[PDB]
């Protein structure tokens, strides 16, 4: 019902600094939809619930991806557009605090444990299948799907890294940081939109309205 192989194949299928960030977000919103469509059972949910799951999740899903992408980078994030944002660029643009939280709580934690792409895919699929999302026609179903992802993820972790009995728990326990950081990032984008200092492209605009 939920093979880690399909989740990995979904990650692999889809592979002013604040202006560059906002352009990259917009670009990745399109990719995000394709990614989700390749997560087993997602495209079978009602269209309304697919929309709710992606509206509840997109920010955490984009942050999980660019954080994991940035593993191979000293004091920076790699954007989907091929540009880097260096610490000092982020700080100089006035998004230093959130950029530092991204490196310390996500990027360096992913690098330090060598989080693999199957593990990233699973965490993102758990995020996607968020049964707390308001207005779901069938939350029980979304929760079942989440249970199947994390069941698969634990089995993968136990088999692949048998020497790390804490790995599964450690992956799950980046999801609170992802939640905080996602909320802080929304708050920045609402402010950018509100003062309208920076271009916000049509899909990113829609995700904020």
């Amino acid at each position: 019902d939920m093979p880690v192989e399909r989740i990995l194949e979904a990650e692999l299928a889809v592979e002013d600094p604040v202006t560059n960030i906002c352009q990259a977000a917009d670009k990745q919103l399109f990719t995000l939809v394709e990614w989700a469509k390749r997560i087993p059972h997602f495209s079978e949910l009602p269209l309304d619930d697919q929309v709710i799951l992606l509206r509840a999740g997109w920010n955490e899903l984009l942050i999980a991806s660019f954080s994991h992408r940035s593993i191979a980078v000293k004091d920076g994030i790699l954007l989907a557009t091929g540009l880097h944002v260096h610490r000092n660029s982020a700080h100089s643009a006035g998004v230093g605090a959130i950029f530092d939280r991204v490196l310390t709580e996500l990027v360096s934690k992913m690098r330090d444990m060598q989080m693999d792409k199957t593990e990233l895919g699973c965490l993102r699929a758990i995020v996607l299948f968020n049964p707390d999302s308001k207005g779901l026609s069938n939350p029980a179903e979304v929760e079942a799907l989440r249970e199947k992802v994390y069941a698969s993820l634990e089995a993968y972790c136990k088999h692949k890294y048998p020497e790390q009995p804490g790995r599964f728990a450690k992956l799950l326990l980046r999801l609170p940081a992802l939640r905080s950081i996602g909320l802080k990032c929304l708050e920045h984008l609402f402010f950018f939109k509100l003062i309208g200092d920076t271009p916000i492209d049509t899909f990113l605009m829609e995700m904020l309205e």
Partner: peptide, 12 residues
């Protein structure tokens, strides 16, 4: 157009 100042003040 005081981008950085506005951003740093709005934040909590």
């Amino acid at each position: 157009k005081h981008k950085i100042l506005h951003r740093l003040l709005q934040d909590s």
